[PDB]
Amino acid sequence: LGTELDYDTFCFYYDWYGSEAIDGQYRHWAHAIAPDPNGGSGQNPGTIPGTQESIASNFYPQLGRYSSSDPNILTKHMDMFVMARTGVLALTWWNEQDETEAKRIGLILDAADKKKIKVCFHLEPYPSRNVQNLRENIVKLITRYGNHPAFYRKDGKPLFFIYDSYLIEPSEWEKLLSPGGSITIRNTAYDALMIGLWTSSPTVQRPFILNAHFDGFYTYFAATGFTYGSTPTNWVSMQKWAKENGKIFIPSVGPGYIDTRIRPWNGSVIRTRTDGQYYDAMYRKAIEAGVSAISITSFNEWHEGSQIEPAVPYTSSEFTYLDYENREPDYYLTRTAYWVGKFRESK
Numbered sequence: 001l002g003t004e005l006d007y008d009t010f011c012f013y014y015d016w017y018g019s020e021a022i023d024g025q026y027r028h029w030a031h032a033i034a035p036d037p038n039g040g041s042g043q044n045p046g047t048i049p050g051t052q053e054s055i056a057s058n059f060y061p062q063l064g065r066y067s068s069s070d071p072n073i074l075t076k077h078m079d080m081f082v083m084a085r086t087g088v089l090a091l092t093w094w095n096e097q098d099e100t101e102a103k104r105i106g107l108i109l110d111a112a113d114k115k116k117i118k119v120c121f122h123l124e125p126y127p128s129r130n131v132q133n134l135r136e137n138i139v140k141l142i143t144r145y146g147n148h149p150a151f152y153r154k155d156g157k158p159l160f161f162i163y164d165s166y167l168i169e170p171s172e173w174e175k176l177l178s179p180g181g182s183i184t185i186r187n188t189a190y191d192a193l194m195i196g197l198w199t200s201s202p203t204v205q206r207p208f209i210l211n212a213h214f215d216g217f218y219t220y221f222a223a224t225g226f227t228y229g230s231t232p233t234n235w236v237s238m239q240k241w242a243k244e245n246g247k248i249f250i251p252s253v254g255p256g257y258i259d260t261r262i263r264p265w266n267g268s269v270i271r272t273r274t275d276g277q278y279y280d281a282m283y284r285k286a287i288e289a290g291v292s293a294i295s296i297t298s299f300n301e302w303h304e305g306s307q308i309e310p311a312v313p314y315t316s317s318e319f320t321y322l323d324y325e326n327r328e329p330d331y332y333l334t335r336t337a338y339w340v341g342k343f344r345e346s347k
């Protein structure tokens with residue numbers, strides 16, 4: 001029918017939103033404003049309070065200030081994934097070691113399964129992250145969730161995205177990811193496809209990826225040109241290298257970028273949506289590069305303005321939000337479904 005989910009399409013999902021009613025605070029809708037890293041001492045940038053009128057986004061959710069722990073919101077999000085045809089939810093994971101995290105992960109897996117969506121983990125740079133505790137956490141996630149019917153596998157293997165993987169040396173990665181590594185996961189019950197973050201130029205990234213023994217790489221950033229890896233004109237040659245070296249390239253595409261509510265000094269990273277023309281151009285480049293899998297930045301990183309989740313016009317007494325302009329609130333979901341079809345036609 002040209003409506004089914006694609007299980008080589010990964011959409012980055014954030015589960016950190018809270019409401020007073022469910023979580024005790026409108027978590028993440030309220031957010032600290034980041035100081036300017038180039039702006040000198042004594043900055044008191046303040047905070048966005050997460051009131052109805054003033055949230056930590058330049059856009060405003062159709063679903064309002066929702067809780068990521070609200071089963072009714074999770075249902076709606078799964079229906080949005082179905083509309084987008086995105087078969088894999090790539091869940092931010094911060095190793096919070098708290099019961100509220102554990103509950104939420106189970107709710108997300110349960111809701112996903114009702115719609116045949118799959119879940120993989122996006123392993124964030126949690127405190128003291130290193131290859132030993134990464135191994136222990138991969139073991140824990142596979143043990144806890146691996147038998148859940150919504151847990152993602154590709155040809156029998158779990159898949160993890162590793163954000164800011166460059167913070168760990170290749171010599172450490174090798175211990176986990178080479179078949180001969182001291183603490184290898186290869187050939188164990190806990191083997192997985194490990195997808196590292198390609199940031200800068202090939203002269204740095206090629207040996208990093210090879211020496212770390214990652215299975216593949218992704219680029220994350222929604223803003224074109226933010227890094228070498230997020231410059232789509234590089235994707236054909238990145239894919240060629242990937243193919244020559246047995247690596248899986250999963251370029252990241254997004255619909256725009258703007259984070260100036262939380263990072264007022266970061267305006268040079270703004271990428272305008274232009275009624276969908278930015279998203280079209282980026283998605284087309286990923287497909288043209290001939291890749292096997294695509295990642296989408298993001299479902300709902302509202303702080304960074306990269307979300308495809310529906311947004312609505314809103315003007316409050318405190319802020320005039322951006323919105324999808326000439327497009328309707330669900331436009332980026334249905335345009336994702338368009339591109340997933342083009343991707344499949346290519347595969």
Ligand SMILES: OC[C@H]1O[C@H](O[C@H]2[C@@H](O)[C@H](O)[C@@H](CO)O[C@@H]2O)[C@@H](O)[C@@H](O)[C@@H]1O
Binds near residue numbers: 226
């Ligand atoms: O432009 C802000 C930027 O913040 C985060 O990225 C930081 C770091 O995590 C990245 O590895 C490097 C890449 O050069 O850039 C930043 O320091 C992300 O949240 C990103 O989406 C955001 O644009």
Ligand SMILES: OC[C@H]1C[C@H]2N[C@H]2[C@@H](O[C@H]2O[C@H](CO)[C@@H](O)[C@H](O)[C@H]2O)[C@@H]1O
Binds near residue numbers: 122124303304
């Ligand atoms: O998921 C990878 C990163 C992508 C983007 N969401 C940011 C990063 O998280 C940092 O920035 C957000 C605000 O944009 C803060 O809420 C987080 O506390 C911070 O770590 C992700 O790591």
